[PDB]
């Protein structure tokens, strides 16, 4: 009935047998128990000529309180594809350790569309996030040590942008002063902690093509500035070698499985606002060699995660999407029309009509702006009536797109058969003219404007004076030709979370612009950003427990 019940009651295959389904020898894998394995990244060099699998991006409409979660569809579509005899696998992100102790934690997907072992994935898993945190904190220690030991690079300690990290929900570490207790114990400065997944190490980890590229990106990281305002890099500190060493094992993608034994890579986990919201390039590229179909996803709605998957990841990974699945629900669209959280169980075509343009804007963006075959996945809910479901299908058909019902949550891979059938159809029959919505040689401001106008539907962008200054400085430093990562709210196409549906007559306000040199993109900031979540009054930690066997209870 519950997710954990279904997970712990399911009969699961040994990971070797899962690895066999994607043509991996037992010399290619390293066991972490019977149900987890790391796959060596060096084998990707052997498949240099094999040609990529069909790539299916699961995205969604702007998230709402009604549902939803697109991962059940990602898992389900992978399960359904294998039930139709296709050699398919999936690539997901790994979840952060911190929130599990705040707000319980949950399944990668849910119902009969999950990945397992759930307990391991929601704790240490294979240790990647620890390795990522250790790299981040080595760099922090080496920055301060260099200053402490003489400061030949002339780093202004007040201008260190690099932050420490920990994978806990600890608001107490948001703003600190460290290096206190006299000259024997450091150099006093203002500092702060991000949760590990927010570190630039994570974005670099997830965007590296190979171990060589990983080290190059690490060296490229800008940790701060000199007294005269010159960037100082991790390479100047000779830190990249040691950081790569700490990430040697972690960089190997993790093989797990769905409930129905579909191979699954769970690897990496950056944010979808201040970063790109996708799982590792190494895992995606490796999955594209070892299978015939690959279903992956990007965080939040298609205005953020998909936009960044297509305009950042695809171009850095040199991969091309063959299909997009835009997940949605009737309830969510009624919410976009004006219906209150409590009143969503009642039929309302007029609200559905008013809030449906949110989906249509997304469907329009993928088909018309990006030029990719698209299908809409409607997750079934008891409340839904035929009239409601028909209007969605009707409006999607006006854009030349099918809206298929999905019951992957209740019925697993069977519930995704019709979706899977349609996905295969649009791959074979649908026209694909994919290209990123902007060219790399465009100016940073123009790129931010392009995404704002083309994807969000804005009249334009209002840059603050500080933003304009920062852009000029970044272009002066030689970063004009990198992609753009806009940090804004997920709940609306605009930068105002209240404006639901398909807002018009609006502009985006960019307050600041900051480079992530390792990641290789510029972050454009709109509102306030949370990089370190806190715990609630009654943390879920209080009800987590162990004893005989262990047997960890209270996680879910």
Active site residues: 70, 72, 93, 104, 272, 300, 381, 409
Among 10, 123, 499, 529, binds a second copy (CB under 8 A): 123
Q: Which one of a second copy, K ion, none is in contact with 160 (Cβ closer than 5 to 8 A by kind)? A: K ion
Q: Which one of K ion, a second copy, none is in contact with 534 (Cβ closer than 5 to 8 A by kind)? A: a second copy
Token representation of residue 51: 């040609």
HSE (side-chain half, CA atoms, 13 Å) at 129: 26
Looking at the Cβ atoms of 142 and 351, the one nearer to a second copy is: 142
- 12 upstream amide cis, omega within 30 of 0: no
Known binding site for ATP: residues? Answer: 64-71
Strands 263-266 and 54-60: unpaired
State the binding string over 208-247 for a second copy (x if CB under 8 A, else -): --xxx--x----------------------xx-xx-xxx-
Least gap, CB of 160 to K ion (angstroms): 5
Select from 143-151, 310-318, 401-409, 463-471 the region that touches a second copy (CB under 8 A). Answer: 143-151
Q: Where are the beta strands (DSSP E) in 82-151?
A: 88-92, 115-116
Q: Which one of K ion, a second copy, none is in contact with 210 (Cβ closer than 5 to 8 A by kind)? A: a second copy
Known binding site: residues? Answer: 64-71
**Interface residues for a second copy in 33-52 (CB under 8 A)?**
33-34, 41-42
131 makes contact with a second copy (CB under 8 A)? yes
Q: Which residue has the tokens 């009054």?
A: 537
Where does 150-297 have alpha helices with state H?
200-207, 211-220, 240-246, 281-290
C-alpha distances (whole Å) from 302 to each of 59, 190, 329 are: 6, 37, 15
The Cα–Cα gap between 338 and 509 comes to 25
Q: Which one of K ion, a second copy, none is in contact with 127 (Cβ closer than 5 to 8 A by kind)? A: a second copy
Among 16, 83, 159, 174, binds a second copy (CB under 8 A): 174
Q: Write the CB contacts of 347 (distance below 8 Å, at least 6 apart in sequence).
A: 383, 385, 387, 388
Among 172, 385, 397, 481, binds a second copy (CB under 8 A): 172
Looking at the Cβ atoms of 162 and 506, the one nearer to K ion is: 162
Q: Which one of K ion, a second copy, none is in contact with 349 (Cβ closer than 5 to 8 A by kind)? A: none
Q: List residues bridging with 54 in a β-sheet.
A: 293
Select from 197-205, 206-214, 443-451, 483-491 the region that touches a second copy (CB under 8 A). Answer: 206-214
Among 10, 13, 31, 66, binds a second copy (CB under 8 A): 31
185 makes contact with a second copy (CB under 8 A)? yes
- Work out the burial of residue 441: count CB atoms within 10 Å of its CB; fewer than 13 is exposed, 13-18 middle, 19 or more buried: exposed
Residues 146/123, Cβ–Cβ less than 8 Å: no
Looking at the Cβ atoms of 125 and 521, the one nearer to K ion is: 125
103 makes contact with a second copy (CB under 8 A)? no
Q: Where are the beta strands (DSSP E) in 329-436?
A: 374-379, 403-406
């Amino acid at each position: 009935k519950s997710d954990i019940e279904i997970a712990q009651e399911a009969k699961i295959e040994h990971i070797k047998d899962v690895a066999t389904k994607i043509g991996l020898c037992e010399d290619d894998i390293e066991y972490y128990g019977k149900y987890k394995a790391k796959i060596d990244y060096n084998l990707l060099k052997r498949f240099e000529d094999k040609k990529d699998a069909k790539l299916i991006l699961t995205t969604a409409i702007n998230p709402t309180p009604a549902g939803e979660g697109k991962t059940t569809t990602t898992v389900g579509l992978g399960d359904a594809l294998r039930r139709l005899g296709k050699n398919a696998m999936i690539a997901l992100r790994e979840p952060s350790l911190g929130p599990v102790f705040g707000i319980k934690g949950g399944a990668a997907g849910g119902g009969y569309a999950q990945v397992v072992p759930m307990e391991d994935i929601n704790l240490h898993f294979t240790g990647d996030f620890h390795a990522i945190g250790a790299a981040n904190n080595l760099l922090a220690a080496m920055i301060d040590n260099h200053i402490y030991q003489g400061n030949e690079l002339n780093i202004d300690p007040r201008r260190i942008t690099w932050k420490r990290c920990v994978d806990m929900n600890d608001r107490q570490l948001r703003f600190v002063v460290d290096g206190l207790g006299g000259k024997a114990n450091g150099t006093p400065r203002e500092d702060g902690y991000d949760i590990t997944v927010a570190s630039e190490i994570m974005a670099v980890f997830c965007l590296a093509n190979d171990m060589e590229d990983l080290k190059n990106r690490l060296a490229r990281i800008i940790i701060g500035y000199t007294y005269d305002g010159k960037p100082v890099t991790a390479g100047q500190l000779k830190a990249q070698g040691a950081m790569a060493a700490l990430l040697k094992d972690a960089f190997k993608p993790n093989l797990v499985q769905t409930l129905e034994g579909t191979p699954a890579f769970v690897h990496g986990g950056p944010f979808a606002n201040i970063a790109h919201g996708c799982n590792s390039i190494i895992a995606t590229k490796m999955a594209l060699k070892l299978a015939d179909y690959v279903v992956t996803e990007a965080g939040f709605g298609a205005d953020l995660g998909a936009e960044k998957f297509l305009d950042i990841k695809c171009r850095m990974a040199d991969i091309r999407p063959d299909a997009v699945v835009i997940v949605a629900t009737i309830r969510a669209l009624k919410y976009n029309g004006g219906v209150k959280k409590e009143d969503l169980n009642q039929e309302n075509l007029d609200a559905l009509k008013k809030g449906l343009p949110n989906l249509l804007k997304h469907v329009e963006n993928i088909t018309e702006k990006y030029g990719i075959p698209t299908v809409v996945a409607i997750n079934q809910f008891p409340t839904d009536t035929e009239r409601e479901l028909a209007l969605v299908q009707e409006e999607c058909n006006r854009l030349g797109v099918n809206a298929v019902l999905s019951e992957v949550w209740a019925k697993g891979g069977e519930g995704g058969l019709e979706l899977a059938k349609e996905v295969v159809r649009i791959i074979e029959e649908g026209k694909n003219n994919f290209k990123p919505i902007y060219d790399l040689d465009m100016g940073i401001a123009d790129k931010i404007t392009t995404i704002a106008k083309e994807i969000y539907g804005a009249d334009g962008v209002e840059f603050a004076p500080a933003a304009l200054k920062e852009i000029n400085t970044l272009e002066e430093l030689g970063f004009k030709n990198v992609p753009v990562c806009i940090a804004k709210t997920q709940y609306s196409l605009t930068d105002d979370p209240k404006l639901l549906g398909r807002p018009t007559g609006f502009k985006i306000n960019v307050r600041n612009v900051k480079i992530s040199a390792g990641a290789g993109f510029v972050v454009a900031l709109t509102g306030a950003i949370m990089t370190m979540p806190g715990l609630p009054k009654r943390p879920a930690a209080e009800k987590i427990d162990v004893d005989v066997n262990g047997k960890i209870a209270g996680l879910f």
